[PDB]
Design a protein around this ligand. Structure first.
Ligand code: CLA
Ligand code: CLA
Ligand code: CLA
Ligand code: LMG
Ligand code: LMG
Ligand code: LMG
Ligand code: LMG
Ligand code: LMG
Ligand code: SQD
Ligand code: SQD
Ligand code: LHG
Ligand code: OEX
Ligand code: CL
Lengths: 240, 30, 336, 51, 37, 57, 60, 34, 50, 57, 30
């Protein structure tokens, strides 16, 4: 569905179909970003629909060839970032710099690895600042903590709110065994995303392409080491 | 090991239920 | 005599010579209850944790995942699902179905059909045996209670996550949150429900003790008194007049049932009517018609509020309200 | 009466109940195989096949 | 149907009980040390 | 080699697994196994002794 | 998207028929059961010992 | 999952059809009285 | 202050702090007492005792 | 300072006594208790069932 | 635990000997 096709559908014709979780496709247009007049455009309707989630696993077979294993999606169609806005600057020499500002720019996603391990992560392009040429322009983005500072764990312990100890254990609480779990932090991390432009419609001011993003997983408020998640998919935007 | 005990206890109770229904003393009139 | 396949099948289905009566309600009861039984046992032993609140915080309810018999439960469907139908075929993978609390809906939906068909199957056997058809009516009281906590309360609240978890500790969480949000103890229908079960327990003990106290001597002291009764006896095994005489003197003559038929109707009506109202109580509280709210009802001459026992209950209700679903509320009012 | 070591000799000349008795051992052996596998799957660690 | 004609009744006299109880306890005494190991 | 001994622990986990994510629960009394076994068999045997005695007469 | 699903949830389809094959599943099964029932009505009524005339059926 | 859905639709329709035509088979006449 | 006297002033020696199925000795619950850590007096920044 | 060395400073032994004057708490599989228990009760019950049935004639 | 289980097994075996001697089935002529 192109952007015009989607706007020709009622909400009741979309509710439940699943096409609400799809970025618009840019048909026709062109394959040369040169058709875009050089300048600073206003990024609008920027949306990134993933097409795959893979999580890096340490190889027990030695060799240290940690590879991204395939996963199974666990949280259904809630994983596309849309309504993301910002500025898009096009250079005559083909240089591209994209900067996200607002919009969804984040979505909690959980996937399950072989063996039944659920790995949650916060798929986000927050504060995405990508620079490069049309064929590939990448940059780093902020991955905030999966759980906020006021998230209470099943024992009532949190970062900005809750107990700072194991109240269930009046004596053995605050021991060295539970020091790591009692103290919780909501610090953020960073990820690397590489975008690529595949279709550009100068007349309508619409661009599209593919992306690849690598970001850490949920650290359980600092209780577990984050895994590496590689997100590949499509993206779409409207320059104006 | 507790999971073994719990499962054995539960399926053991259902085993008694099965036998009480089908392997019961039939009620015979006088 | 019957030669047609359907004529022979219908005779077998309605046959009263089967060890367990099947009947036409049984062709609905048996497949639904076996389906719910199979998934319940499998899920109670080996189901993965379920994200009940829709906040991506799974709750373990299986024996193989660290629970015992008391704390094990089938977790209700995810709050993200809501009241939406979630069969296994609407999930991309069976792992996703398990994660979102799929097994709960499968059990509850097939179980509701099972108890409704079990109720009809009770009528059907009575008709086939030529007895009066109201044991099924007495069974409608527990059916209503089961329907209220598994269907109607989730319906009014807007999510299957608000149904009663299929577990022991899960049941207690259901009751405590229910008190905090609806003040069920102050509702006149749980009051009638309590009188139904306290009274029913009282009447069961009194009727059982009065009949046992009046057993006609037919055995020796080295044998069980039960041996004095032979299955199929045409005569009475206890003296009703003697039991009425005892209970007549116990309170006063006209406080006792001289009629066994009236007595047994009373033994059936009192608990059934009581459970009907407490089942209605949960159903009414499903649409947020809470129990009596007497908070700050007593104020002095100058306006100062004098606390009562109702206000102390509110203090306990306040504590449960601010702790249930700790991470699920972003806004001050618990409208959901 | 029968010595304890000759109890299962009652189905010596009962073909119907001999089949039932051999169906019971088969049920137990099959039940053990399923139970044994489930127990092993609850303990087996497939993470490190080499070492 | 008609009752099964192969019915028998198992017997265990007291001296067999003492032998059986002795074997179980003696064998347990023997193997307990190894089972604990 | 103690560096490599702790290298594997922080890396890919050790063997023998556990039911689900974690089911060791070493705090479990374990004596409850004997308590549960003795509470089952001893009364069960008492009931079976009386029934077999009764069923044979 | 990453996975495939029927995506028929909450779409208000008649009898939940997302694909026409479900229609054949229900129709064929109902017709079969109706078929065996239809050719047995006379035999079932014959057991009543009355003819299914305008005065047939349990009536108080 | 459609295969599973069609199988369940076949099964559910089968037992419901038996229930419907079962009670249409002179059910009221199946009583021990006269 | 005798260490025996101080040990009585510990809520872990209170017989109304246990559980029906918290089986065993009081040593199995909170450990074996090793020594008194001394009286802890809490002071405000201004010096007032809390 | 930190009481982490306080429990270490308890060189004088402070623990419930072992069954031996030279201390007897060795690594034996607790499954031995259950195995011994089952091997005793299960065959004992079997013999008592048969004897009480026989003794009652 | 082992020391307790060894003692019960030993005294249990001794207890059987006592009953086998005094509470024995008496040998009766014909
Ligand atoms: C498929 C193999 C097989 C089969 C079908 C039989 C069948 C039979 N045997 Mg036999 N036997 C076998 C193998 C087999 N045996 C072997 C390998 C040996 C050598 C040890 C013997 C030695 C033997 C003797 C000495 C006698 C019999 C007797 C009998 C008859 C009565 C059994 C009875 O009631 O005692 C019932 C037994 C008990 C109630 C308790 C004893 C059970 C043992 C001791 C431990 C149980 C092990 C465990 C629970 C089951 C797993 C075993 C499996 C791993 C192999 C019966 C028809 C008796 C006979 O001939 O009757 C006249 C008899 O005197 N058998
Ligand atoms: C459709 C039936 C069926 C199927 C497909 C299976 C399949 C399986 N079973 Mg199972 N089993 C079954 C029925 C079945 N079983 C029944 C009915 C029982 C109860 C008796 C069992 C009891 C059982 C146990 C105890 C075990 C299995 C196991 C297994 C697995 C490995 C089998 C194996 O490799 O061992 C190899 C099989 C053999 C070597 C059989 C050899 C047959 C001998 C050599 C015959 C020799 C004499 C013969 C009469 C020759 C004369 C004729 C000749 C001249 C032609 C496998 C997946 C094993 C497992 O992994 O656990 C899950 C396991 O230990 N099964
Ligand atoms: C008035 C009787 C009495 C009292 C007050 C005590 C008190 C005490 N005993 Mg004790 N004991 C008694 C009788 C008694 N005993 C008898 C008759 C025996 C012989 C079996 C023992 C053998 C014994 C041993 C071996 C030990 C003690 C120990 C102890 C101390 C620990 C208490 C404890 O944890 O128990 C806990 C009680 C419970 C966990 C549950 C109580 C029972 C419940 C409420 C009844 C429920 C019914 C039943 C359990 C259902 C069974 C279900 C099935 C699955 C098991 C404590 C001061 C322990 C100790 O401290 O060592 C110094 C110790 O190891 N006792
Ligand atoms: C009469 C009844 C007898 C007992 C019937 C038991 C039926 C159990 C339900 C089967 C089931 O849930 O399958 C559930 C399976 C799902 O099992 C698998 O799940 C995986 C993810 O976890 C895969 O991604 C697929 O979804 C699927 O292959 O249904 C299927 O998709 C299998 C194909 C259709 C099977 C039809 C069986 C008839
Ligand atoms: C709340 C609902 C019910 C609460 C309990 C009500 C019944 C309590 C016991 C009553 C009883 O035992 O006798 C039940 C009584 C007994 O009723 C009499 O019984 C006699 C034999 O026992 C005879 O059969 C009389 O014909 C019959 O009228 O029936 C009544 O309930 C009528 C009471 C009338 C009193 C005035 C009402 C104004
Ligand atoms: C009050 C009645 C409310 C329902 C009225 C419509 C009935 C048809 C219907 O529910 O569609 C069927 C619906 C729809 O079914 C669902 O539809 C969804 C889209 O809306 C999706 O497509 C799902 O995949 C699909 O399963 O739900 C059911 O499948 C339940 C059917 C269960 C039948 C139980 C019969 C009980 C016995 C009856 C005995 C005879 C009387
Ligand atoms: C008779 C023969 C048949 C026996 C069958 C077996 C029956 C078992 C029933 C349960 C027995 C075990 C109970 C729990 C044991 C336990 O938890 O661990 C085992 C515990 C000991 O527990 C251990 O103790 C050790 C120190 O020795 C350490 O402290 C360990 O940390 C601790 O776990 O044993 C007991 O303490 C139980 C002794 C009995 C205490 C009874 C107190 C209450 C008495 C009467 C109550 C009366 C009425 C109640 C209502 C009716
Ligand atoms: C023929 C009939 C045969 C009957 C056999 C009966 C046996 C009954 C038990 C006899 C042994 C007593 C148990 C001793 C015990 O368990 O430890 C009980 C105590 C435990 O005190 C021990 O102390 C030692 C250090 O001083 C150890 O290191 C440990 O502290 C502790 O194990 O051990 C004894 O000192 C027992 C000595 C006195 C035994 C008198 C037994 C009289 C028996 C009459 C029957
Ligand atoms: C720790 C304990 C283990 C817990 C296990 C829990 C599950 C099983 C619980 C069983 C409890 C009931 C015991 C009493 C039953 C009784 O009296 O039966 C009544 C009949 C009457 O006898 C028969 O009676 C028949 C007719 S009637 O019954 O008399 O009407 C007659 O025809 C025939 O001649 C006569 O022999 O007794 C039997 O012959 C039944 C078979 C013997 C009992 C076997 C039970 C154990 C089965 C194994 C279970 C474990 C493994 C399972 C693997 C699939
Ligand atoms: C040594 C100390 C205890 C150690 C216990 C160790 C456990 C293992 C040994 C005991 C179990 C095996 C015995 C089996 C008995 C049997 O088959 O004969 C049955 C006996 C024979 O006497 C009956 O007596 C009859 C007379 S009358 O009919 O009763 O009048 C007569 O016909 C004939 O003698 C007989 O039939 O019947 C009885 O009257 C015996 C009583 C029941 C058995 C008691 C067992 C428990 C003993 C005490 C346990 C606690 C120990 C601690 C003490 C403080
Ligand atoms: C599921 C697992 C649980 C089931 C287990 C069932 C247990 C099976 C029964 C086995 C025990 C009963 C058999 C013996 C009871 C018994 O004697 O039965 C009596 C029998 C012969 O007696 P009768 O044939 O006259 O009577 C048998 C009875 O059924 C009738 O009274 O002897 C034997 O069967 C062989 C046993 C001889 C002796 C056996 C062991 C001897 C070793 C002694 C060790 C102690 C001293 C050691 C010093 C070094
Ligand atoms: O989901 Mn179950 O609990 Ca009926 O309130 Mn609102 O929502 Mn939730 O909170 Mn409270
Ligand atoms: Cl909660």
């Amino acid at each position: 569905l192109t952007f015009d096709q989607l706007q020709g559908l009622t909400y009741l014709q979309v509710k439940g179909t699943g096409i609400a979780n799809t970025c618009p496709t840019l048909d026709s247009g062109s394959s040369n970003v040169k058709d875009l007049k050089p300048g600073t455009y206003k990024l609008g309707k920027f949306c990134m629909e993933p097409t795959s989630f893979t999580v890096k696993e340490e190889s027990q077979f030695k060799g240290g060839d940690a590879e991204f294993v395939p996963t199974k999606l666990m949280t259904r169609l809630t994983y596309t970032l849309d309504e993301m806005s910002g500025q898009f600057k096009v250079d005559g020499s083909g240089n591209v710099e994209l900067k996200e500002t607002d919009g969804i720019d984040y979505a909690p996603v959980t996937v399950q690895l072989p063996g039944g391990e659920r790995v949650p992560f916060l798929f986000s392009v927050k504060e995405l600042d990508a620079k490069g040429n049309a064929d590939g322009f990448g940059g780093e983005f902020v991955v905030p903590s999966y759980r906020g500072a006021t998230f209470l764990d099943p024992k009532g312990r949190g970062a900005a709110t809750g107990y700072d100890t194991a109240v269930a254990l009046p004596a053995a609480g605050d021991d060295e065994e539970y020091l790591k779990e009692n103290i919780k932090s909501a610090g953020a991390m960073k990820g690397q995303a590489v975008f690529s432009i595949a279709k550009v419609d100068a007349a309508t001011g619409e661009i599209a392409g593919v992306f690849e993003s690598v970001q850490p997983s949920d650290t359980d408020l600092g209780a577990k080491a984050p895994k590496d998640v590689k997100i590949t998919g499509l993206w779409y935007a409207q320059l104006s | 090991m507790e999971a073994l005990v719990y499962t054995f206890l539960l399926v053991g109770t259902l085993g008694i239920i099965f036998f009480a229904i089908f392997f019961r003393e039939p009620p015979r009139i006088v | 005599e019957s030669t047609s396949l359907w004529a022979r099948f219908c005779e077998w289905v309605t046959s009263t010579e089967n060890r367990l009566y099947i009947g036409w309600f049984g062709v609905l009861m048996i497949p639904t209850l076996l389906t719910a039984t199979s998934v319940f046992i499998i899920a109670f032993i080996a189901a993965p944790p379920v994200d009940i609140d829709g906040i991506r915080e799974p709750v373990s309810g299986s024996l193989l995942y660290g629970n015992n018999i008391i704390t094990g439960a089938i977790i209700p469907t995810s709050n993200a699902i809501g009241l939406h139908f979630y069969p296994i075929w609407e999930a991309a993978s069976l792992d996703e179905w398990l994660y979102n609390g799929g097994p709960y809906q499968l059990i509850v939906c097939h179980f509701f059909l099972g108890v409704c068909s079990y109720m009809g199957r009770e009528w059907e056997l009575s008709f086939r045996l030529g007895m009066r058809p109201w044991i099924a009516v007495a069974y409608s009281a527990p059916v209503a209670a089961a329907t209220a906590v598994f269907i109607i309360y989730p319906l009014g609240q807007g999510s299957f996550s608000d149904g009663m978890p299929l577990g022991i500790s899960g049941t207690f969480n259901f009751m405590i949150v229910f008190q905090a949000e609806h003040n069920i103890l102050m509702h006149p229908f749980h009051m009638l429900g309590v009188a139904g079960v306290f009274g029913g327990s009282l009447f069961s003990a009194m009727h059982g003790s009065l009949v046992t106290s009046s057993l006609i001597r037919e055995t020796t002291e080295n044998e069980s008194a039960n041996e004095g009764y032979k299955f199929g006896q045409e005569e009475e095994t206890y003296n009703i007049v003697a039991a009425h005489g005892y209970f007549g003197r116990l309170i006063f003559q006209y406080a006792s049932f001289n009629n066994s038929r009236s007595l047994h109707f009373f033994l059936a009506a009192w608990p059934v009517v009581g459970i009907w109202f407490t089942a209605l109580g949960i159903s009414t509280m499903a649409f947020n018609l809470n129990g009596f709210n007497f908070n700050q009802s007593v104020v002095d001459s100058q306006g100062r509020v004098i606390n009562t026992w109702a206000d102390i209950i509110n203090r306990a209700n306040l504590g449960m309200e601010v702790m249930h679903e700790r991470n699920a509320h972003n806004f001050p009012l618990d409208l959901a | 009466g029968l010595p304890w070591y000759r109890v299962h000799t009652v189905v010596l000349n009962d073909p119907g109940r001999l089949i039932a008795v051999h169906l019971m051992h088969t049920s137990l052996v099959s039940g053990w195989a399923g139970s044994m596998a489930f127990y092993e799957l609850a303990v087996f660690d497939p993470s490190d096949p080499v070492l | 149907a008609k009752p099964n004609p192969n019915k028998q009744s198992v017997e265990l006299n007291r001296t067999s009980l003492y032998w059986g109880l002795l074997l179980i306890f003696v064998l347990a005494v023997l193997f307990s040390s190894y089972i604990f190991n | 080699x103690x560096x490599x001994x702790x290298x594997x622990x922080x890396x890919x986990x050790x063997x023998x697994x556990x039911x689900x994510x974690x089911x060791x629960x070493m705090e479990v009394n374990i004596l409850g196994v004997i308590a549960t076994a003795l509470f089952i068999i001893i009364p069960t045997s008492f009931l079976l002794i009386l029934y077999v005695k009764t069923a044979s007469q | 998207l990453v996975d495939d699903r029927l995506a028929g949830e909450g779409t208000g389809k008649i009898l939940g028929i997302n694909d026409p094959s479900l229609f054949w599943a229900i129709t064929i099964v109902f017709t079969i059961v109706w078929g065996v029932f239809y050719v047995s009505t006379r035999e079932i009524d014959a057991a009543s010992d009355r003819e299914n005339d305008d005065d047939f059926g349990l009536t108080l | 999952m459609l295969t599973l859905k069609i199988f369940v639709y076949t099964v559910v329709t089968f037992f419901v059809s038996l229930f419907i035509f079962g009670f249409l088979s002179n059910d009221p006449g199946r009583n021990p009285g006269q | 202050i005798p260490e025996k006297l101080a040990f009585y002033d510990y809520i872990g020696n209170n017989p109304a702090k246990g559980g029906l199925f918290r089986a065993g000795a009081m040593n199995s619950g909170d450990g074996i007492a090793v020594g008194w850590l001394g009286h802890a007096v809490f002071k405000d920044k201004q010096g007032n005792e809390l």
